């Protein structure tokens, strides 16, 4: 949608990987069946010992849900950043 | 500016294999990704961002043996290079305790992913952007 | 019995292995001398096979404690880390026994690592076993200079890094890192990986990959590198043979065509076929004792039938003749009187080949004066025997100055075929590459290969079985299956041949029952079910139902 | 063909029952009686491989005999009669140990007691590493004789089984004889197992009956 | 023949090598070449 030359990078998907690991330490993103922290230290024990899909299917593979509806993104996303166009589908 | 167009923070003919590996690898990623419908479709003559799935042994040496350049047949050198492949994180198994092959309720699927996979197909110079 | 018990131990002129050859004739002379010769090459060979062998590990220990003990001024207390690309589980590193420093190392399995807990409190238990021979938590870290008087030095060895739950060495190495707090410890990591760096920055977090890459090296053990030990082996196969043994072509072929089939271990199978085709040639080859010219007396007539039948002989008989020579020569060498082409063969055997010669200096004109390195001996070798080595020098660029020094011209000798060695009769294959699947095939479909009244009639029930899998479909309804077994057995030949015995009255017993072919049709045909799951040919559904079945293989893939 | 795996409500119990105690009888009696000579033959003829495979054998190069049939018998025969004794009688009694492959009940570590009383003088793999450090400074003598049936046994499959038989044969002084059934067998070693395992591959089979191996497992469960 | 189809199905080493010519045609050439020779 720019005009063309008379004689925005596309970030490589290697670097991205430290933006999707912040999305996921921040709690935006959970995973598909996350239980989350346990009530009692007998089930923790048990959580600790079982290992989900989840730490074996590889990075990109990894499925997530989101805690923000899209809703709520251009609710509180201010007009004047430059994908606030992109907000809505 | 070299320095900076790169984020550097990188580790660093990406996957050294024999041939029978390279066309085990191409057969094994159809394997994961082509529904077991299109089988006798395709090879007998008569998708690219969901997780794979599981494959049965005789599928996988079936397609490979449809798509290796008479027969190739099944020898120790295939199945010892499947094993590596194994033993080299490139296929995952359903088992994480007292690994046994032979068990048969094991599965096969993929570990490799789209970019590796086109090229390798591309060094071996196999068309697999048609079969999808 | 001793058979139902898991495993038990067994007590019980002089043998030579090497068996006559024509028929009997070889005198026990003539076999300790081949014997002994085949003796003497060997250990001969493994004199320089072995001595590469270590001077290949004595280099990488080298390497290996050069990289680990290049200290380096870091203001920052940081781990070391070396990547052994290519390495397996196999390696072994010894540390420096310092005074003021205590080093230990300690191995870290898959089975080792199932969570942090696990791994801290096996880390501190090797480390206090380590230091218990001097004379489970970090508390020991800290504590360790108070309780030993000592430096602490720690090196950790990953044994295999990909079977190894990434996220538990994520969280390990951060925990790892809370021991730069205190002055008297160091920390060394060793990663064997198999394949490249690339799983490594796939699985780990990229916060883990910084904290390891500010100080790591890089080192590629692997067993190939551009054939500078593989050129060696070769090199030093040919010197053991000292002339008296010559490569054919096909030989050749096959070593190349089955080298490229293994990518990490290709120095092994090199000398595994080394070492069968020189077992076989002084199994095999009567005239191996004839190496040494002094034991040409003892030639015999049954010696000259071999000679006659060499094809260099054959034609050279028929140049004999076309070439209008006397017929008493023809009938000399008929009537094997006055076996001058005895002494031709004894010339034969002092001509020394100059391909050999021509070989080496060409090898190391290409090492040194060209200072080419990249190339496979092999190769060269073949191109030499074919005599195609122009085309295999017009792969390097810098060879037309030399062309000419470097051209040699293959020579066919006479007798020559006697001391060489082939691939011809595939022995080679069906002992060290098999076809392991199709053997076992075409073993049940053409049992006719294999084994030399119901006998004479009947093939063995496995078989018989087999033909109805190859038949069958991918799922089978168990009882389907036992009735067309059923229907292809000789009922009435099977009762009569159950009815021979007399005695035997447990079997007359159940021939009286009208359902007896019934039962002993089931009964073969879940003993061969049952032979069939052993080998890996059927699988139940016993979840569902033990009644239908899936089969395992397919014929001919 | 590949094409013929592309191109692919009864009960068990329409089929007349059969006890165990009835199962047994007719297996033992076509077992005993039919294909006895040819096979008797057959195995004669094979015998004469014994020079072949003790020249292998002190060369270094395991032996793994796969085929139809039952293979315990020929290791038995080879290994009391015509291994040990010679080995003895050329090198101047050998001790042979024998591992049932077929019985699931199997231990790797009680059998590595036996190994270790047996070779070493007075963390499997850390002793083993032992074993082959004190072994170079050896004489390249045969001392001990491994024989392990059914390399695709049950407990066997497993990989650290496999792991611990693999070291044994880098130790010379040591002799390995393996025996296997399942046609996909060769899917368990990888290069590096093939590298330390050293076998030569024999076609062996007989279609002997496997008497021994069917008594570890339920016919009735059929 | 049986017994060189087991050898060679058995990868014995007491199995000839077809390398040289067999004995019997060569047998069969010298006795071809010598019955008009004189």
């Not at chain 1, 008379?6 to 935006?28: C, G, H, R, S, Y």
């Not at chain 4, 060769?186 to 395992?197: G, S």
Request: with cysteine.
């Amino acid at each position: 949608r720019i005009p063309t030359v008379a004689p925005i990078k596309l970030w490589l998907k290697k670097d991205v990987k430290n933006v999707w690991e912040n999305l996921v330490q921040l709690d935006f993103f959970t995973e598909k069946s996350a239980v989350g922290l346990r009530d009692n230290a007998t089930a923790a024990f048990y959580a600790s010992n079982y290992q989900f899909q989840g730490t074996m299917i590889p990075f990109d593979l990894r499925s997530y849900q989101m805690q923000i509806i899209l809703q709520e993104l251009r609710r509180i996303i201010p007009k004047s950043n430059m994908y606030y166009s992109w907000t809505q589908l | 500016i070299k320095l900076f167009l790169s984020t550097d923070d990188n580790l660093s003919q990406t996957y050294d294999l024999s041939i029978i590996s390279k066309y085990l690898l191409i057969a094994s990623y159809i394997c994961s990704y082509l529904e077991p419908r299109y089988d006798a479709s395709i090879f007998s003559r008569k998708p690219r961002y969901l997780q794979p799935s599981l494959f049965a042994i005789e599928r996988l040496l079936a397609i490979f043996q449809a798509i290796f350049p008479s027969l190739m047949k099944a020898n120790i050198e295939v199945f010892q290079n499947l094993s590596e492949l194994h033993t080299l994180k490139l296929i995952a198994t359903t088992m994480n305790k007292n690994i046994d092959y032979l068990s048969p309720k094991v599965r096969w699927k993929v570990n490799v992913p789209w970019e590796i996979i086109k090229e390798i197909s591309e060094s071996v110079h196999f068309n697999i952007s048609d079969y999808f | 019995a001793d058979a139902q018990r898991s495993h038990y131990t067994v007590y019980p002129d002089k043998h030579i292995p090497f068996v006559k050859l024509l028929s009997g004739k070889e005198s026990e002379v003539n076999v300790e001398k081949r014997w002994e010769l085949y003796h003497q090459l060997h250990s001969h060979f493994h004199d320089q096979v072995d001595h590469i062998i270590d001077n290949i590990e004595a280099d990488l220990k080298a390497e290996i404690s050069d990289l680990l003990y290049s200290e380096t001024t870091q203001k920052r207390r940081c781990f070391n880390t070396i990547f052994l690309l290519g390495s397996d589980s196999t390696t072994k590193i010894e540390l420096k026994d310092e005074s003021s420093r205590y080093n230990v190392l300690i191995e870290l399995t898959p089975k080792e690592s199932p969570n942090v807990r696990m791994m801290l409190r096996r880390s501190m238990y090797k480390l206090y076993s380590a230091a218990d021979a001097e004379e489970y938590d970090l508390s020991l870290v800290e504590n360790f200079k108070r309780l030993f008087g000592k430096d602490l030095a720690m090196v950790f060895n990953f044994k295999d890094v990909d079977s190894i739950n990434f996220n538990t060495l994520d969280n390990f190495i951060i925990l790892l890192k809370s021991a730069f707090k205190y002055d008297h410890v160091k920390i060394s990591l060793i990663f064997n990986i198999n394949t490249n760096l690339s799983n490594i920055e796939k699985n780990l977090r990229q916060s883990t990959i910084r904290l390891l890459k500010r100080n790591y090296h890089k080192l590629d053990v692997s067993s190939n590198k551009g054939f500078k030990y593989g050129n060696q082996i070769f090199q030093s196969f040919l010197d053991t043979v000292d002339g008296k043994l010559n490569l054919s072509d096909r030989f050749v072929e096959f070593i190349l065509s089955k080298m490229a089939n293994n990518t990490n271990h290709n120095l092994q199978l090199l000398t595994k076929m080394l070492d069968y085709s020189l077992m076989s040639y002084f199994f095999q080859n009567a005239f191996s004792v004839f190496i040494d010219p002094v034991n040409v007396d003892f030639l015999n007539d049954d010696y000259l039938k071999i000679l006659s039948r060499c094809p260099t002989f054959m034609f050279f008989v028929e140049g004999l003749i076309k070439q209008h020579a006397p017929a008493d020569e023809i009938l000399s060498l008929l009537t094997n009187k006055n076996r001058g082409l005895e002494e031709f063969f004894v010339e034969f055997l002092v001509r020394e080949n100059p391909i050999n010669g021509h070989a080496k200096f060409v090898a190391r004109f290409l090492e040194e004066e060209l200072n080419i390195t990249n190339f496979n001996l092999i190769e060269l070798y073949h191109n030499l025997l074919i005599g195609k080595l122009d085309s295999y020098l017009d792969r390097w660029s810098a060879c037309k100055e030399y062309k000419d020094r470097l051209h040699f011209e293959p020579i066919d000798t006479i007798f020559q075929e006697l001391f060489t060695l082939d691939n011809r009769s595939g022995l080679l294959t069906q002992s060290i590459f098999p076809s392991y699947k199709s053997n076992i095939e075409d073993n049940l479909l053409s049992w006719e290969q294999v084994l030399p009244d119901l006998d004479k009639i009947m093939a063995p029930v496995l078989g018989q079985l087999f033909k109805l899998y190859r038949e069958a479909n991918m799922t089978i309804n168990i009882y389907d299956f036992y009735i067309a077994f059923r229907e292809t057995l000789p009922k009435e030949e099977i009762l009569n041949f159950i009815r021979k015995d007399p005695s035997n009255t447990k079997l007359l017993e159940l021939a009286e029952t009208p359902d007896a072919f019934d039962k002993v049709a089931l009964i073969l045909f879940m003993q061969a079910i049952f032979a069939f799951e052993n080998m890996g040919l059927i699988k139940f559904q016993s979840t569902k139902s033990y009644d239908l079945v899936e089969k395992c293989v397919w014929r001919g893939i | 063909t590949f094409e013929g795996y592309f191109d692919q409500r009864h009960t068990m119990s329409m089929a007349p029952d059969v006890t165990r105690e009835e199962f047994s009888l007719v297996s033992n009696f076509f077992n005993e009686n039919f294909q006895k000579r040819p096979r008797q033959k057959l195995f004669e003829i094979q015998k004469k491989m014994f020079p072949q495979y003790w020249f292998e054998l002190t060369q270094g190069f395991s032996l793994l005999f796969y085929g139809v049939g039952s293979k315990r018998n020929f290791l038995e025969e080879f290994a009391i009669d015509y291994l040990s004794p010679k080995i003895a009688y050329s090198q101047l009694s050998i001790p042979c140990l024998i591992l049932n492959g077929y019985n699931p009940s199997c231990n790797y570590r009680d059998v590595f007691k036996e190994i270790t009383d047996l070779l070493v003088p007075a963390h499997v793999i850390l002793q083993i590493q032992k074993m082959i450090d004190f072994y170079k400074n050896q004489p390249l003598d045969i001392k001990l004789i491994l024989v392990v049936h059914n390399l695709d046994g049950p407990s066997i499959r497993k990989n650290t089984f496999q792991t611990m038989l693999s070291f044994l044969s880098v130790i010379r002084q040591i002799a390995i004889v393996a025996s296997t059934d399942h046609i996909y067998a060769p899917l368990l070693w990888d290069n590096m197992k093939a590298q330390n395992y050293n076998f030569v591959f024999h076609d062996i089979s007989n279609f002997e009956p496997s008497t021994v191996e069917s008594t570890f497992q339920d016919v009735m469960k059929m | 023949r049986y017994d060189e189809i087991i050898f060679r199905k058995l990868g014995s080493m007491l199995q000839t090598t077809n390398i040289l010519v067999t004995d019997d045609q060569y047998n069969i050439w010298k006795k071809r070449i010598e019955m008009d020779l004189a």
